[PDB]
Each structure stands twice: as C-alpha cells, then as structure tokens.
Symmetry: D2
C-alpha cells in the first residue's frame, strides 16, 4: 500500500485522480484518464488526457500532470503518482510513451498506483518495474 | 498588430513568454523556448519546452503552455499566444506539431506572436495563416 | 502539376487510392493512403497505422516517407498524393506530417490531396501548407 | 544457443542486417544512429533506421521504421524476432517506451527482442512481456 506515503495522503491522491478525469478533452475516443502527482513538498497536481483530430498529437493524463509539476518548479523528488481511467474492469496502466516520460524525472523505486474507473481494482508498481532497462541519457555521449 | 487585444495585455504577454524560457528542461539541445497564452478572461498561462532522452517524448513550449491552460479548465476563447526562444536574430516559429495542437482550440483569426530571443522584434500571424486547410473534425 | 508529367501524376493518384488497403486502423476505422514520387520517378506508398495509445499513431504520409527514406532517397522527391477517408472533402495533411515533409523537400514541393474516391482534388505547395516553417 | 525458436544462422543474419541498417539513418540532430532488423513468420528480413526531425517530437526510431516496412509489406503478425543495434559502444541499445508500445500492438508476449551495442560486443535478449509489463495493449 505504497511505502513512504501516509494513508490520508494516498486517499487524497486517489480522490484527486478520479476527479481529474473531469478535465479530460476526449471527443474522439471518449475515454477519460485522470492523474495526480504528490510532490516532495506534499503538494498535489492533477492532469487529464487531451486528444486531437490528429491522433499523434494526443497528450496522456500522466504527461499533462507532469507538465504541471515541472512548470511549477518541482524538478524532482516526486513521491507518488496515481492514475485513474474509464476502464470498468481492468486497471489503467501508463502507456509506453508516458513511462518513458516519467522515467526521465523519477527514481527507480518511484511508486505508481493504477486504478480502474471506481478504484474497485488497484495495483502498485515502481518505475523500475514498469520500464526495465530504461533507455536514458547514458545511451547518448 | 493583434486586434481585439489591448496593447497593455500584449506587452504583458511578451514579457511572460520571455521569462517562461527559465522553466525549460532542455539538458540535451540546450535550446530554450518560452510560450504564453492569454485566456478570454485575461489570465496568463506560460509554458516551456521539456526534453527527454528519447527525442520522441519531447514537449514543445507551446504545448506545455496549452496543457496548463486546459488543465485550468479554459477549453475555449483564448485571445493570443506569444512564443519566444533562444534565437539570436530570427523569430522562433511554432512547429507543425504545435500548430495542429493549437488549431484544435482556437478560431482562424487567433493571433500568434513570434519573438526573437530578446523580444526587440516580432512577427504576427493568425492560426489560419500558419496552418491553411487544416485537418479537422469535419474530416472525421 | 508543375514539373510533373501527367503519366506520373495519374500513376501517383492511383497508387494513393489503393494504398489505403494497407491501413491498420481498428480504432478510428479511418483509412488513409499516400504515395510519393522520387526524383528517380519511382513510386512509394504508405498507409496509416494506429495504436491503442493514440500518441503512437503514424499517419500515411509518414509511413510513405519512411519507405522512401529506408530505400535511400533522402532528397529530390517530386510530388506527394494523399487520399483520405473523407467522402466529399479533400484530405489535408495534419500539422505533424507537414513538419515531417518540410524536413526533406523544397518549398515548391507539390502536395496533391484527394477525397476518398479521387473525384475531387486540391493541390498546394509545401510552403503554402507550412508557412514560416520551423 | 542464444535465442529460442531462432536458428543460429538466421540470427547471425539478423545482427548483420541491423548493423548495416544503421547507415540508412537520418540523424543530423543527435548524431546517434540506430539500426533494427525484423524476422517475419515467412522468414524474410526487414530493416530500419532512425529518422530525426528539427521538431524532436517528430522523430521515428529504427524499431518503428522497420515495423512500418514489415506492415506495409503485408506481414500483420507472426513476427519471429527483432534485433536492435545502436552507436553506443559501452552498452546495448534498448527500445524507448514509445517503440515498446508500438511493438506491443502486433506481437505476442514472448516475442524476443535482441539488443546489441555498436559493434556487437554486448548483447541482451528480453521478451516483449518483460520490456513492457501490464501493457496498455489491444488485449
Ligand atoms: Zn500515455
Ligand atoms: Zn512545436
Ligand atoms: Zn498526419
Ligand atoms: Zn524508440
């Protein structure tokens, strides 16, 4: 149940993620996704997916949330991320594009909580687990 | 230039875009770009480019700025956008990816102001001029 | 089309129309086809490829360009035709594709856009479609 | 033996094709070249290289270039193996999250992905399932 995070904080994060879905702009898939991030200063940021007529332009909820955090000055030290989506049964897991984005700013043990639309199903995995052998700045020279 | 927008607001937009470059995360290209957007109720949002080891994952300043706007619940009626980048002489222009993103939320007369790195010069173009015969929902 | 022999343009339009059969689009069901004429007067074709993650979708224009580039033609393309799944409206390239094309062609590069059947056509240069390119 | 289900000759041929595919790379911004090779069910080999753009967001990795080739050739599934090799000598080139999500759309969980360094010195074999767990895929 996510180490390094108070029960109240985790409860708050999950509430923030479900509510973030309301900010979704998805007139093409109609599939809404919400995401919340807890900073090292215990501040909560939220994001939602934003689609576009040109499908390549879609921005996921996770990336929206991270953009918000980064623009607010929080370069690192994030404590947790919660992702919630309009999936009735299965939990919403971040897509590869988002995993690559998250990997750029968090430590290997960074916790990512994935929920289904109501939170009746949940899973917790670390950044390291979701993106093994991550491609990073080390591959450049 | 830039009708329907007071000069006071345009000026404030220009400085915000200039200063937005400081929020950039570009440890790879080292090229910084700042963007500011004025909403219909005259609130200013700013954004900067965010790079990634994987070039595919980079987010331009214009898109980071629009994300800020959208996540604040302003899904329509933006009044103007100013882009400023680390370009000595020439005015930084929005790439095609960002033009397509912007086109999704603004009218054709939407003004896009492009500044040089110092903000001593500018060039104004409308969304319609920057992305003619744009791919839109009507097509879908 | 300036500088394009009519037999090349006709062949291009035909290649674009049939290219949409290579499309993988189970999400939008919107099939798009694209063909490119090399300076070599060789025709290459592409179709859109979608993905569960919309961000990963590759348009037909880009699939066609990948094909041309992987064949070793990094310059001198003569024309491009795009055939969209829009019945009564010519399909125009999205901003992402315009930026991609701009990387390899001259400002006068012609881009022909057709509706789903090819009964309607519209031509525009690269420079007209992406003014003041980045 | 190195990779299950793949003959030693085939693989050898794949590694050579991937290394050679690097010369087709268009990378004037990062200068980092990447080559990729794919073995179809039909035993045919396709190759691809990375293609960059002034707008970094528009870059297409070698893995995606090779898959576009395969798909446009009519091979919608049943791929046997994928080989990836980059300019990085001191370590193998692993696919970025973008490519993993793309590959995941067309292959089975046990699909083998071979990663090599610039020369071929180092190598590592991992399956699609290991590279992208809890994948947000078609299934
Ligand atoms: Zn995602
Ligand atoms: Zn851009
Ligand atoms: Zn496109
Ligand atoms: Zn990649």
């Amino acid at each position: 149940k996510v180490g390094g995070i108070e029960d109240r904080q985790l409860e708050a994060l999950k509430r923030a993620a479900l509510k973030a879905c309301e900010l979704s702009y998805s007139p093409y898939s109609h599939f809404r996704v919400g995401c919340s991030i807890l900073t090292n200063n215990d501040v909560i940021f939220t994001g939602a997916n934003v689609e576009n007529a040109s499908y390549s332009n879609c921005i996921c909820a996770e990336r929206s949330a991270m953009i918000q955090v980064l623009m607010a000055g929080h370069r690192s030290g994030w404590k947790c991320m919660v992702i919630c989506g309009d999936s009735e049964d299965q939990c919403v897991s971040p897509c590869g594009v988002c995993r690559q984005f998250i990997n750029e700013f968090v430590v290997k043990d960074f916790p990512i909580v994935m929920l289904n639309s109501t939170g009746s199903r949940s899973k917790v995995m670390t950044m390291g687990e979701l993106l093994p052998m991550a491609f990073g700045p080390s591959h450049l020279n």
